[PDB]
Amino acid sequence: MNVGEILRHYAAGKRNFQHINLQEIELTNASLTGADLSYANLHHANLSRANLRSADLRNANLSHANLSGANLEEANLEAANLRGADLAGANLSGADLQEANLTQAMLGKDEDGVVYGADLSDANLEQADLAGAQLVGAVLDGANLHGANLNNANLDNAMLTRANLEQADLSGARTTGARLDDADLRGATVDPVLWRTASLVGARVDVDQAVAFAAAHGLCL
Amino acid sequence: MNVGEILRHYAAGKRNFQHINLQEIELTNASLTGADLSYANLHHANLSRANLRSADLRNANLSHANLSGANLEEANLEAANLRGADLAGANLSGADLQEANLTQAMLGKDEDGVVYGADLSDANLEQADLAGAQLVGAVLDGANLHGANLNNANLDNAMLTRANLEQADLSGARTTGARLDDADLRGATVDPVLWRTASLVGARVDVDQAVAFAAAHGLCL
């Protein structure tokens, strides 16, 4: 569908656009709140600064899409393909992102020196795949990351306060300056470096993990 | 016995003086190496800078004695009464001090600002009573403190590297700047502050203790 047709359809009050193929489209600053776009094809699309509050995008293809500064509050993105997408500074507060594919995604940019961290406060990321994602300065306060895959992700200066990290895999993840106060870490897989880098006041941990903390500050068993 | 008699007896080669009453005597800079003084009464005596290398003083009464800078290398002081004795700067390297009473003793003075720490390297202090002793800047590298009582003792800036502290009671002990690298702490009773003050590289610890270390750096279980 082209831009003229779909703006007419939205303006007329139509909201069900599920499975629609919209690959490579240019829609900077567009506003399409409450839209049903489940299973839609949006590969390599430009959606910089768009307002998509309360959209349904479950299982949608968003690979290498530009979403810099976009609004997605309380959106359904369960199992959505976001591999390599540029989400620097975007607002995803309270969104459902369980099982979502976020491998290599840009969720916190420091490219020019300055931090453009994405907002993920209170988001559902149960079992989400974030392997290799860049989250420099991102804010994830209170998010549910039960079982999430964070292999080799960049979490430098990221805020994870009060976040549920139970069973999350952080092997190889960069955590220099990460802020994990009150986070639930029970059962998460981590490197010892984490214990020496992250702020961990109130962090809820396993016994295994507390011993690794001790060992990371030089204690020998 | 008076000073003239006993210097004559030592000079003639006599060495067995066990149980002798020598209370309040003035013997500064005296040299009486290899002497048998087991069970002797030496309450409130002045022995500043004396050489007593390899003496047997088991069970001797040395309460409030001045022993500042004295030499006691490889001496037997098992169960000796040293309550309130002034041992600032003394050399007790390799001495047997098991079961000894060291309550309130001065083993490291900072009275005028400057540290006069006593030397206890490789000493046997199994089950010794050190409650309330002042050990500012003392050096106890490799000492055996299995089961020693250290209640409310001052260990500020003291070196306890590679020391055996198994089953020692450190409740209330001041440990600011203490150096415990490689020390065997398994089974010792400690306050959480210790974990935030002492240097603990290689320190051998219980699981209980490693969790207290974690908890002392703010982790919540």
Domains of chain B, start order = 15-221 (2.160.20.80)
- What CA–CA distance (Å, rounded) separates A130 from A147? 11
Q: Which residues of A55-91 are buried (b: 16+ CB within 10 A; e: fewer)?
A: bbbbbbbbbbbbbbbbbbbebbbbbbbbbbbbbbbbb
Kindly identify which residue of chain B lies nearest to residue A203, measuring between CA atoms: B219
CB A66 within 8 A of CB A86: yes
Residue reference for tokens 């320190």: B203
- The two structure tokens encoding residue B116: 């006069």
Task: Give alpha helix (H) positions in A89-218.
Answer: 193-197, 207-216
Token digits for A123? 């988001």
CA torsion angle A55 A60 A64 A67 (round to 10): 0
Q: Is residue B92 within 8 Å of residue B112, measured between CB atoms? A: no
- Chain B: give the shortest CA distance to residue A120, in Å: 24
Chain breaks in chain A (C to N over 2.5 A) after: none
Instruction: Give me the amino acid identity at B88.
Output: A
CB neighbours of B9 closer than 8 A, spacing ≥ 6? B1, B17
Which residue among A200, A218, A220 sits closest to B219, beta carbon to beta carbon? A200
Angle between helices B207-216 and A207-216 (to 10 degrees): 80
Among chain B, residues having any CB pair with chain A shorter than 8 Å are: 182, 200-205, 207, 210-211, 213-215, 217-221
> What value, to the nearest 5°, has the Cα angle with vertex A53 and ends A14 and A80?
90
Q: Are strands A106-109 and A134-135 parallel, antiparallel or unpaired?
A: parallel
Contact state of B200 with A210 under an 8 Å Cβ cutoff: no
* Alpha-carbon gap, residue B185 to B165, rounded angstroms: 5
Q: How was this structure determined?
A: X-ray
Q: Cα A41 vs. chain centroid, distance in angstroms?
A: 20
Q: Return d(Cα B3, Cα B19) in angstroms, integer.
A: 16
Which chain A residues have a beta carbon less than 8 Å from that of B182? 220
Do the Cβ atoms of B213 and A218 come within 8 Å? no
Is residue A18 classed exposed, middle or buried when 0-12, 13-18 and 19+ CB atoms within 10 A define those classes?
A: middle
CB contact under 8 A, B218 and A210: no
Residues from chain A contacting residue B205 (CB–CB below 8 Å): 214, 219-221
Neighboring chain B residues of A197 at a CB cutoff of 8 Å: none
Cβ partners under 8 Å of residue B73, min gap 6: B53, B54, B91, B92, B93, B94, B95
Q: Which residue numbers of A have CB closer than 8 Å to B's CBs? A: 182, 200-205, 207, 210-211, 213-215, 217-221
Enumerate the β-bridge partners of residue A153: none
How many angstroms is the resolution?
Answer: 4.4
The label of the residue with tokens 């040395």 reads B62
- The rounded distance, in Å, linking the Cα atoms of B137 and B107 is 9
- Given an 8 Å threshold on Cβ–Cβ distance, is A219 in contact with B200? yes
- Tell me whether residues A210 and B214 touch, CB distance under 8 A: yes
Which residue reads 């690959």 in tokens?
A23
- Rounded CA-CA distance A164/A1 in Å is 40
Do A54 and A76 contact (CB within 8 A), yes or no?
no
CB-count burial class (<10 Å; 0-12, 13-18, 19+) for B54: middle
CB pairs under 8 A between A and B: 64
Amino acid (one-letter) located at A170: L
CB atoms under 10 Å from CB of A1, counted, come to: 11
Where are the alpha helices (H) located in chain A, listed in sequence order? 3-11, 193-197, 207-216
Tell me the β-bridge partners of A101: A81, A129
**Could you tell me how far CA A74 lies from the centroid of its own chain?**
13
Q: Give CA–CA dist B199/B161, Å, rounded.
A: 9
Among the partner-chain residues B204, B207, B219, the one whose CB lies closest to the CB of A220 is B204
Chain A neighbors of B221, CB-CB under 8 A: 204-205, 210
What 3 state SS string does B48-60 have?
CCCECCCCECCCC
Beta bridge partners of B134: B106, B154
For residue B186, the chain A residue with the least C-alpha distance is A221
Task: List A26's β-bridge partners, or say none.
Answer: A46
Q: How far is CA A58 from CA A18, A115, B201, in A?
A: 10, 29, 51
Q: Closest to A210 (Cβ–Cβ): which among B201, B202, B211?
A: B211
Q: Find, in chain A, the residue whose alpha carbon is nearest to that of B211.
A: A210
